[PDB]
Every structure is written in C-alpha cells, then in structure tokens.
Amino acid sequence: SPFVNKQFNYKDPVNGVDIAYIKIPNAGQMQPVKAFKIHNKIWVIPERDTFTNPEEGDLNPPPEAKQVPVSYYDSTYLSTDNEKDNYLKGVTKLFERIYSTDLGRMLLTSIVRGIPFWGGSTIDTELKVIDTNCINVIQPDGSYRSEELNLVIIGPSADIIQFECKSFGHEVLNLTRNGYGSTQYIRFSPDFTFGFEESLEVDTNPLLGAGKFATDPAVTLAHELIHAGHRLYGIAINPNRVFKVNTNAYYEMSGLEVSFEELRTFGGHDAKFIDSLQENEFRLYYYNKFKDIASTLNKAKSIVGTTASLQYMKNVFKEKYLLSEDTSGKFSVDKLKFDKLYKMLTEIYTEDNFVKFFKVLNRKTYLNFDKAVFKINIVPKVNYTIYDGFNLRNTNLAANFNGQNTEINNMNFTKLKNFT
Amino acid sequence: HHHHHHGSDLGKKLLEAARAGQDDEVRILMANGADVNAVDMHGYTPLHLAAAVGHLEIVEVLLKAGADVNAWDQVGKTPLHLAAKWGHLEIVEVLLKHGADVNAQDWMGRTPFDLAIDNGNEDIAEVLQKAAKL
Ligand SMILES: [Zn+2]
C-alpha cells in the first residue's frame, strides 16, 4: 500500500490526468511545464523554479562578490531530462519514507485534508475557490481545465539550497495567518543535502567543522512539509516575529534573529524559546480565526464554480478544521477539539520528532551553522532505502549512523562547497 | 535644517494605510516621502490595494503622485483587474481615465472584463466591453 501509486518516468507520455502540461500562477506568461500528480492534491514539477518569483526569472547568480558563503549556484542543474527523471523518483522515494512512519503518515493525511478555504467570493454568503489556489491543466483540445491542489514540489531557484515553502497572496486576505490556507509551493531537491557535525560544540561554531555528517533529505523535506501543514491550515506565525538569539554568542555577535515559525517547526528545545505569553496569544488568536470560518460556513447560501453541493463543500471543511456540528446543523469550534488540532500541527509535526522516528542523526538545534553541501543520489537501493535511508540494514552502515558519515560512506556524498 | 530619519520602512506603512482606507494616513505618509510604487511581498502596489478596497479618494491622490496604473502583481493582475472584481465603478472609471490597459491578462488569460462578469458586475462589464471596442 504505497503513498505514490505510480512509478512515474519523466519520459512517460502525458495522459492529461496524473501526467499533464500545466500552468502555475506566475507574473509572466509562462510556457506550460510537465507536472505529475503523485497523490491526491499533490503535484511534482521537476523544473527549476523560474516562475513563482517575478525577479527570479533566470538562474543567473549574483556577482561573485555579493555571494553569501552559505549558498550554491549551478545554472545547469535539473536542466536535462535524465536529472528530471531522477529528480522525480527521488522526490517520490522521499514521500514514501516519510509516509512509512505513523507520524509522517498523519502529516501527509493532514495535508491532503487541509483544503485551502473557499473565501474567494465577493458576495458575503456564497462560497468560491480562490483562483491562485488552483492550477491550469492542459486538455487534449489545447483548452485549459482548472484543477485544485494543496501542495506543489518544485525545483530550486537561483540559490539551489534555498529550500522554502511559499504560496501566493490575496489582495484583501491573509491566507497563511487567517485560517483559510493556500496552495503551497516547495522549492526542494532530493539531490543535495547539508553537512553538519555530531559534536554540538563544533556544530554551533561558524569557523569549525567540515560537514562530518549528512542531513537525511527526508527530514529536510519533512521540515518543509511542516511549513506546509501550518500554512495550509492558516495558523502560521508572521515571518517578522523573530527571536533575538542570546544562546549563541556567534549569532549574538552578528546580531542574527531567527523567526518563531522556523523555531516552532524544528521543535524540541528550540520551540521553547517562545515564552508562554507568546504561545498563548497565538493559540487564542487562531482559535478565533476558526470561529470566523465557522461563521462564514453558517452564513453560506450558495456555491459557485463546481458541481459539488453546498452542504457537501461545508462537510469538507468540517473535517479539515474539526468543527462540531449540532442538531440544527450550525458549525462551532469546540475549544478542546481545536486545542488537539492546534497542538498537532505545532508541537507534534516537528523536525525533531521526525528525527526520533527516522532514527537518523540530525542537527540538535535550528541555531547552528551549515558546514558543507553534498551531491547525493538516493534513487539506487544500494545508496538509500525507503525504510532505512542511508543507514542500510544488516550492513556496516547501520551502526552509529555510519550511513550518514560522509567519509565512511564516502561514495554516497560528493562535496561541492565548503561553508566553514 | 530639517533632517528627519525614517525609523520604519514607509512602503509597508503606505501599503497598510491604503489597504485600510486611512486617507489622512496615506496623505501624511506621502508628505514624508513614502514611495507610491512600493511593493509588498506579493507584488501589490498602494494602487492595487486602494482600488480593491474601494477608496476613490485614495486612488486619486496616489495617481496624482505618479502611481503606475498598469503595474501588475505576481499573478499578473493590475489595479484595473482588482477594481472590476470588487464592483467599483468609480474606481474603474478613474483607472481607465488615466489609460489603464483594458486588455491586461493575468496568469489564466483573464482580462478585467472577464473578472467583472465572473463576479456579477454587469454595469462594470459593459463599460470595459465598450472601452475595448472603442
Ligand atoms: Zn523552515
């Protein structure tokens, strides 16, 4: 029972259903690109992302002098068909590994159920889909069929290791912080991984360590999938709510500040930098946001743009936000039901808890310094397996996380750049 | 002699002020040097927001200060696209009066005429229809 039913090949013909030419919301008039529906409401564009940002239309790097040490530029990556095939199967295998844990199995089920809310209409009482929460799928005629989706895995932009989770905004709505949600676009590559040190003292020092170990890409993708789970349920923290790092002299020296959002995503001790007063206000702030959505659903008189019934589309959102329905049929938010749902996306879906269940070596905090970038190929089963990743079972790579050791398993990790 | 220092970015305050229809706040921020063509993280200009929320006097004061009537966001919509969507006839007339492109197309191919008829704005669609056939 796999999460991704098909063994997609980039070379596969477009059938117009789960393999089709599509158009993403973009500032230009982009040419359609090939995308694969690996799962319900999840698509994979194995292209470099020149479309989401109007100022990053090209993959040219900045002047050699304006480049920051922690970056890697390569305009030729993911440009040829063979890398597009390998990229697609790598992303697919990474979903299988996440899904093979009850924790990731729940995360992926919460994402597919987290439909961006239908707050698009200009009339108070009718429900409508926000256009930017959809994609344009090409038909055989050449006509364009609009289709809804929740997640999109796309290739990196100019900065190859600038992994992130982004969505398109609304002129009058704050979809990521009002509960509604929005289709998420993740820049991610299964062919690259960051180097880090097992020794915490070395890992928190900018000037030491050369990337003794390698991050497991399923944790990296699991980290960005948690960003999606926050933004899809509309409970993300404003990215300008930053923490004045006082626990790392090297951060304090440079005056760095990490956003509460990423600290929450990492979890563990990191998520405790947020003080109880700050956590309390957000929970209450978004508990009220679900009440506004429950109020909008109760004042729903019509539905536009689909053949689904009004009652049916309310039900999709009762199951998403876990609203309570009384005898008369009016939706409400049960504070305890919400608190269970709120804690799930904030304290349970964390990079830390995922490392515990993958049983991999990982950074022990978000406040560290990346030591190197490696080129990996996770598609061969002699390199990387769904159930064990790099630390293959029964081999010498299982003990002491040896499979993640970039010198003991020196054939699976090719160093490209030294940040240290 | 009269040197002031900007403690906060004036673009974001101008965009927030135009979104909530605080005409005096827009007019005051414009006096202290806010950029009428600044952008938010989504490509929205003060005119995009002032037009989508329906503020006639805010739209005019900005256009007087040199706001791009044909600037587009990250999905290709212009101030004319938004004003037709939210049923603002007076805003749509002002934008046209200043030479907004009635044929601007967003990512999906839609013009401000399509958005108008797709949101039940008949009287605002007949104006855009006529202006196109002129
Ligand atoms: Zn992150």
Specified resolution (Å): 2.7
Q: What is the DSSP string of A358-386?
A: HT----S-SS----EEEE----STTT-BT
Contact (CB, 8 A) for A276 and A99 = no
A269 lies in some domain: yes
Sequence-distant (6+) residues with CB within 8 A of A282 are: A235, A237
Packed helices A217-232 and A81-99: angle between N→C axes, nearest 10 degrees: 70
- What is the SS3 assignment for A240? coil
SS (H, E, C) A180-197: CCCCEEEECCCCEEEEEC
| Cβ-based contacts under 8 A for chains A and B | 59
- Token pair for A108: 């992926």
B92 contacts B128 by C-beta, under 8 angstroms: yes
Write the CA distances from A174 to A77, A178, A182, B87, integer angstroms.
Answer: 34, 6, 10, 21
Say if A88 falls within a structural domain.
Answer: yes
Residue A53: its chain B contacts at CB < 8 A? 74
On whether residue A392 sits in a domain, the answer given is: yes
Q: What are phi and psi of A244, to 5 degrees?
A: -80, 95
DSSP assignment string, A147-168? EE-SEEEE---SBTT--EEE--
| CB contacts, 8 Å: B48 with chain A | 171
Q: Is residue A104 part of a domain?
A: yes
Tokens standing for residue A3: 């999460």
Min Cα distance B93 → chain A (Å) is 20
- Taking only Cα atoms into account, the Rg of chain B, rounded to an integer number of angstroms, comes to 15
Residue A172 in any domain: the answer is yes
Cβ neighbors of B126 (< 8 A, separation 6 or more) are none
Number of domains within chain A: 1
Neighbours of A295 (CB within 10 A): 14
Is B10-133 in CATH node 3.50.7.10? no
Please indicate, yes or no, if residue A376 is contained in any of the structural domains.
yes
Domain annotation covers residue A1: no
Asked if residue A149 belongs to a domain, the reply is: yes
Q: Please indicate whether, in this complex, the C-beta atoms of B76 and A53 are within 8 angstroms of each other.
A: no
Residue of B41, B48, B76 with shortest CB distance to A27: B76
- Look up the domain containing A111 and give its range: 19-418
Q: Which of A122, A120, A142 is nearest to A131 (CA)?
A: A120
Q: Check CB contact of A268 with chain B, cutoff 8 Å.
A: no
CA–CA dist A129, A137 (Å, integer): 16
A324 contact partners, CB below 8 Å, separation of at least 6: A331, A332, A333, A334, A337
Which residue has tokens 């004042």?
Answer: A299
Query: Is A156:A187 a contact under the CB 8 Å cutoff?
Result: yes
Reading the block at residue A210, the tokens are 């050369």
d(C-alpha A281, C-alpha A207), whole Å? 38
Nearest to A172 by CA among B102, B65, B40, B119: B40
Q: Which helix (H) or strand (E) holds A259?
A: strand A257-259
What's the CATH code of the domain at A183?
A: 3.90.1240.10
